[PDB]
Amino acid sequence: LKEPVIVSKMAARKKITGNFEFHDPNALLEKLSLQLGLIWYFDGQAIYIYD
Amino acid sequence: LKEPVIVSKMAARKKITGNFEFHDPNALLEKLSLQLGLIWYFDGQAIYIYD
Amino acid sequence: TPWSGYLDDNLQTQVTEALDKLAAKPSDPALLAAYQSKLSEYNLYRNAQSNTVKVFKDIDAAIIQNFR
Amino acid sequence: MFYALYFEIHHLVASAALGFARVAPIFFFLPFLNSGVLSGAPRNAIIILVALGVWPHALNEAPPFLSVAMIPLVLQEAAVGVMLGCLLSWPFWVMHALGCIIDNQRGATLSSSIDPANGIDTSEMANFLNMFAAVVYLQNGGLVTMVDVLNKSYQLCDPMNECTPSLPPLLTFINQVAQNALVLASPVVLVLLLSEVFLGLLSRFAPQMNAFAISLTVKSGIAVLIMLLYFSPVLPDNVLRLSFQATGLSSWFYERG
Amino acid sequence: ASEMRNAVVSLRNVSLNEFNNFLKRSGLYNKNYPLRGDNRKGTFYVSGPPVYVDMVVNAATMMDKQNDGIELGRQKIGVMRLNNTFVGDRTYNLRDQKMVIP
Amino acid sequence: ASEMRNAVVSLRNVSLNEFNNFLKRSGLYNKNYPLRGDNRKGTFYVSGPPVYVDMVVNAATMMDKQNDGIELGRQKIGVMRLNNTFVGDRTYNLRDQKMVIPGIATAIERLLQGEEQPLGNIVSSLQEALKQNAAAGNIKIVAYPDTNSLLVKGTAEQVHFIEMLVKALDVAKRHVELS
Amino acid sequence: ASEMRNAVVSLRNVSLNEFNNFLKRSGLYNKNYPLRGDNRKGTFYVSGPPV
Amino acid sequence: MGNDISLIALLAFSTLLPFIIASGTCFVKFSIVFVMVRNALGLQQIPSNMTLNGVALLLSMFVMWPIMHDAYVYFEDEDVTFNDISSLSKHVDEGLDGYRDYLIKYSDRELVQFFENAQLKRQYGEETETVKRDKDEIEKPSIFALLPAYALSEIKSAFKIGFYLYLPFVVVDLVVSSVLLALGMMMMSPVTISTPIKLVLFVALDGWTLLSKGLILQYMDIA
Amino acid sequence: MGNDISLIALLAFSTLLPFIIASGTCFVKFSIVFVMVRNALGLQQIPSNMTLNGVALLLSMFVMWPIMHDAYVYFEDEDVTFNDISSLSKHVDEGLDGYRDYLIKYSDRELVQFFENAQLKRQYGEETETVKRDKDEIEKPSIFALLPAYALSEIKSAFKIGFYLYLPFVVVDLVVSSVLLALGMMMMSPVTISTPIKLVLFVALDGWTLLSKGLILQYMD
Amino acid sequence: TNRIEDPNLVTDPKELAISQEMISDYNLYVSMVSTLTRKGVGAVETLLRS
Amino acid sequence: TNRIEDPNLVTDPKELAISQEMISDYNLYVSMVSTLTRKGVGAVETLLRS
Numbered sequence A, B: 001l002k003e004p005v006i007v008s009k010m011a012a013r014k015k016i017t018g019n020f021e022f023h024d025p026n027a028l029l030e031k032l033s034l035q036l037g038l039i040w041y042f043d044g045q046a047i048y049i050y051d
Numbered sequence C: 001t002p003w004s005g006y007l008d009d010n011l012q013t014q015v016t017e018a019l020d021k022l023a024a025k026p027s028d029p030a031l032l033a034a035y036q037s038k039l040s041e042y043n044l045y046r047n048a049q050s051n052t053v054k055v056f057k058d059i060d061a062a063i064i065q066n067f068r
Numbered sequence D: 001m002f003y004a005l006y007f008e009i010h011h012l013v014a015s016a017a018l019g020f021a022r023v024a025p026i027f028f029f030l031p032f033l034n035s036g037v038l039s040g041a042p043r044n045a046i047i048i049l050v051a052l053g054v055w056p057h058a059l060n061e062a063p064p065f066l067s068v069a070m071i072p073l074v075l076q077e078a079a080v081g082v083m084l085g086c087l088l089s090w091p092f093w094v095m096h097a098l099g100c101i102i103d104n105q106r107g108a109t110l111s112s113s114i115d116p117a118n119g120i121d122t123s124e125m126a127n128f129l130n131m132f133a134a135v136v137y138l139q140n141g142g143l144v145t146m147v148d149v150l151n152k153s154y155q156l157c158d159p160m161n162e163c164t165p166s167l168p169p170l171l172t173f174i175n176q177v178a179q180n181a182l183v184l185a186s187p188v189v190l191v192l193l194l195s196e197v198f199l200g201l202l203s204r205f206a207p208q209m210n211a212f213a214i215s216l217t218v219k220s221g222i223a224v225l226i227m228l229l230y231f232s233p234v235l236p237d238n239v240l241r242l243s244f245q246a247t248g249l250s251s252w253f254y255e256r257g
Numbered sequence E: 001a002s003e004m005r006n007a008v009v010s011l012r013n014v015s016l017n018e019f020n021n022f023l024k025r026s027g028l029y030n031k032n033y034p035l036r037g038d039n040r041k042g043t044f045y046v047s048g049p050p051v052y053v054d055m056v057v058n059a060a061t062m063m064d065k066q067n068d069g070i071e072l073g074r075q076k077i078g079v080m081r082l083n084n085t086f087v088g089d090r091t092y093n094l095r096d097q098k099m100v101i102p
Numbered sequence F: 001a002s003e004m005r006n007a008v009v010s011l012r013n014v015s016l017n018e019f020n021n022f023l024k025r026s027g028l029y030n031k032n033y034p035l036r037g038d039n040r041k042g043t044f045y046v047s048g049p050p051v052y053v054d055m056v057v058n059a060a061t062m063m064d065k066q067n068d069g070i071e072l073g074r075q076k077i078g079v080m081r082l083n084n085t086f087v088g089d090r091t092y093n094l095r096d097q098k099m100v101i102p103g104i105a106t107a108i109e110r111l112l113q114g115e116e117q118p119l120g121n122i123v124s125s126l127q128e129a130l131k132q133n134a135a136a137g138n139i140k141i142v143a144y145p146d147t148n149s150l151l152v153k154g155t156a157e158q159v160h161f162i163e164m165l166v167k168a169l170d171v172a173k174r175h176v177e178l179s
Numbered sequence G: 001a002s003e004m005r006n007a008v009v010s011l012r013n014v015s016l017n018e019f020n021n022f023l024k025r026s027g028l029y030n031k032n033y034p035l036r037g038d039n040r041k042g043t044f045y046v047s048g049p050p051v
Numbered sequence H: 001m002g003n004d005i006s007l008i009a010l011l012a013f014s015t016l017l018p019f020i021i022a023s024g025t026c027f028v029k030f031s032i033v034f035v036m037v038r039n040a041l042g043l044q045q046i047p048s049n050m051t052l053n054g055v056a057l058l059l060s061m062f063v064m065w066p067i068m069h070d071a072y073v074y075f076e077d078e079d080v081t082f083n084d085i086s087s088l089s090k091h092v093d094e095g096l097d098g099y100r101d102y103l104i105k106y107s108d109r110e111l112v113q114f115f116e117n118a119q120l121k122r123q124y125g126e127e128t129e130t131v132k133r134d135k136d137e138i139e140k141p142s143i144f145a146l147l148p149a150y151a152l153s154e155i156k157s158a159f160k161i162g163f164y165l166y167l168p169f170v171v172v173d174l175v176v177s178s179v180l181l182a183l184g185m186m187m188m189s190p191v192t193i194s195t196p197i198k199l200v201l202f203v204a205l206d207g208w209t210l211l212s213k214g215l216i217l218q219y220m221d222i223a
Numbered sequence I: 001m002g003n004d005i006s007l008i009a010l011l012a013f014s015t016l017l018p019f020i021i022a023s024g025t026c027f028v029k030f031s032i033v034f035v036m037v038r039n040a041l042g043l044q045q046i047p048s049n050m051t052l053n054g055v056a057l058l059l060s061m062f063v064m065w066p067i068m069h070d071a072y073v074y075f076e077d078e079d080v081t082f083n084d085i086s087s088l089s090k091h092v093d094e095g096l097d098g099y100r101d102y103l104i105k106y107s108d109r110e111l112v113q114f115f116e117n118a119q120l121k122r123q124y125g126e127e128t129e130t131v132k133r134d135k136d137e138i139e140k141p142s143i144f145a146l147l148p149a150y151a152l153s154e155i156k157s158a159f160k161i162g163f164y165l166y167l168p169f170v171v172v173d174l175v176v177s178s179v180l181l182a183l184g185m186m187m188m189s190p191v192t193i194s195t196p197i198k199l200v201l202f203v204a205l206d207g208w209t210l211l212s213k214g215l216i217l218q219y220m221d
Numbered sequence J, K: 001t002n003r004i005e006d007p008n009l010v011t012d013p014k015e016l017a018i019s020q021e022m023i024s025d026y027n028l029y030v031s032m033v034s035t036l037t038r039k040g041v042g043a044v045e046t047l048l049r050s
């Protein structure tokens, strides 16, 4: 992503397993957001992720 | 780096292992910042590193 | 009262003098105009002083009475 | 920000208050801390100071428990404190049992009395050996290990994570204490039994001899004589092998949260 | 290293250059921890060892307050000869009207 | 060594080059721990053993208060002759108007009246700056016809400026004949 | 020796030379602990036994 | 701020807490059985009353602490609404059913019913009891009716248990005495011989451990 | 007073004074030794606590007075001494060393070290090097860390002293019990006989003289 | 709040009336916890002696 | 609380006289409930520790 990433505690409780490919990570991120039920934002300096 | 370095209390918990060559400390600093999830800054007198 | 160890009257004479000049010739308009000013300033000075000294007494008393 | 020091003092007293719940029961069990010795105005002043000396978090930031029902929490902490009081008491209760066994075998039934500081029936020997253990323990610096195990108890299991004593090991505890006491008292019981049977055998040739009454004259001297020989190992036996240690906290406590 | 102190200072009567010259004359200046700001302006950032920072802050504050005892709006006088007209006001006594020209 | 103390001291009526002389005469001066600052200005840093530091800071504060009682704005009287004109105001009764011509004293006085900033210059070191601060409204001028001369009261600088302005003003007049 | 006291004294109306003569006339002066300062000015430092 | 009456209720409850524990909790049983077994082994003051009461107290908490915590979790519940003193009473009563059920499980129905009658029937001009069909009253015996009926049943259970533990020690005493007589080594008191034997035998079989498990397994599954 | 905050601080200190005496003065020790003596003789209510605490407080006065007087004249002293925030904070801190020296002189080095390290690991983080100042000049430790070490040190030594005093009375008790069993009077409670022998033993020793002498000599050469 | 907005608002009567609630309520909460812990410990000691 | 927030109630003598009574009656009521509750639990405690 080339951006520091900051995760809320209520999101930190969730676990994940498997083998992932990080290419076009923005697309990957926005897909997982909907599957896992997260919301996220980007102010221009860093990425924030919440339940 | 030729500068004093200050590391926050919450960053000091993380641990690292291996061999490192200091050919270009600036590049190494940026790479490891993104890999380990740190942010850093440089007032011209000293380097400051945070979680 | 000094804070132990801490590093770090003319208007009365002026009014007395003006009174003595005036008393000698109560009908001189210049001596009257001068005395009026000296007496007015002296009056204000004494009042402001005594009000301030009371305000500090009452703060010290309130402090003591809070723990007493 | 003007009020910050005022709030910072209140965070301190709220932390001390919640620490008292866990430190005071220890002061109830140990023989040199109970109110038979340390009483009046010193008592609270000292307990609070210790609790502040061992609280694990910076005292100047808001306590984390403000959002929680207070009673379940206080009872949880008091139960933990009772468990620690037992484990730290463990070397003394064995010597007390030993003394009670000896004073029972030598007769001496009537000598005992209930101690008001604890509510425990105390013989003449038992009080002596119970003191003597305390002094050797203090001399060896066990006092440092006591505060140590307290601090570690907070680092390894935290009030907010619902730390709880393990049930399976707790179920063995009484039997391990009784075992240790018997294993240690045995040498005296054996000799006093052989003595009384020897006298009973001798009585066969002189049936008017009151072999019972003779044994009461003899057995107390025999008891003290034998214990005087095996007395010196008492110092090492208790000081190290029976004293609890900070490493054991892992097995007796775990976090349920 | 963890003891580094830093602060922001803002002065009204004294230039950053003025202060730097003070330090240089004193022999207190240190090129590893220089003051950072606009020479023209009075607002600067300073960071370094405790003794250095504290000394700088105290000196700057006191020097700033001292200069309030000073005034520099020096008034000046100029003489301007009129070559084409009389300086004074003029009254014209018209038989029916008195007229004044300022 | 851990007991080293240090302080920043600031003065209003004395200069570092003055206070050094005091220490020397006293025999208190110590070249291992000299005062560090600007001789021209009243602010310095000092560091050293406790006793030394305390003595320095006491003495410097109390000498500053003692000098605080002494005034130095010495008023100077200058006497200036006019060579080309009459000192007094004059009235000419034209038919159309009563007309008045003001003399030098009147003009200058009216101009400086109520001034509050220092007088700087005319066109057609802390112990110095505190003299240069003297206000323009104090200058007093008294016309003295008996010798056709002005009496001027002010600081040495002020009197000098007044002298220049007078010599810029009293030009000799030309004569005209109307036929 | 550990009890030596010292103080800074300043006088408005009385010069150091005026005060030394006072001590001399009194017979109180002591050349081991003389006053240190400027005979012209009125400010001086003194140190010695408490009394 | 909060509510000033709920504050009174909190402080009051915390003063009564030790008497409730001492009279309406399994502590009643655990503290009795241990002391009985200790007397039967014939050597008082081993273990100490401090040891016994301490353990009994700890074990009681595993049984009771979940019920209290469940009740507070029931009350800290931001979605309720009320309209009247009745609607509030019902909800507060409903909060205590978790405890009520425990008391109902471990106590006698008929003694409970007797006290349920005795609270009222001094008022009553009548003999008929059917007048309320059971389904309400069988669920809702009052807590003051349940408490003494529970304590009186716990004690009886304790005695039942201890009875069966006495028997083997009695047997051992008879055996010792018969041996001394058969040897004719008559003039020796048997207690001096048999108390060591009872102690060593019970400790060598870990009686205290089996006892602790057998007590807890009435109230929990350890796994 | 010349300053108001200087007054507020004095009234606060005077409001917390008794707990400082109860937890940071030899009173904590004298109070324990006398209760130990009363336990030893097997008494319950006499002498009263008010009498034993009375003498304990008087004896503590002879020992603590010199440093309280020293602090008093140090803070009254009228000579000019401070000018500015750093000099005032150093002046106040310097005024407490007369009492830090006391706490440090009687606290156990091992406990002082424990309470110091456990504060460093709170503030700067547990990864900060555990000091192990085994040969030590403990660098003016904080008084909040120093005070509980003193309290537990005095409790330790008072218990230690109290132990020694039992041993004669323990002998008395076991002897009496043995001679009664030798006569077979199993139904006689020994305590009735052994209490007066303890009293006359202690009176013959003159216990209170020896004991009050030694307890004071431990604090002054 | 550490070096944001401003300090020393001892003086505005609208915010000074909001501080009164907090300064009181936190003192009461802390006072209550002090009693509850004593009660709890006292209940444990009461049972263990008896 | 409402009687104080509302500006026409907190500024008319007729209404203030009533609010004074409401406040005092509240105070007395709560103080008496507290007292009697304490006396009650204290009786239980006195008997059971005897």
Ligand SMILES: CCCCCCCCCCCC[N+](C)(C)[O-]
Binding pocket: D075, D076, D079, D080, D163, D164, D165, H058, H061, H062, H063, H065, H066, H221, H222, H223
């Ligand atoms: C020891 C009393 C204080 C802590 C409260 C303990 C509550 C009981 C928890 C038991 C959990 C048993 N388990 C894991 C089998 O469910």
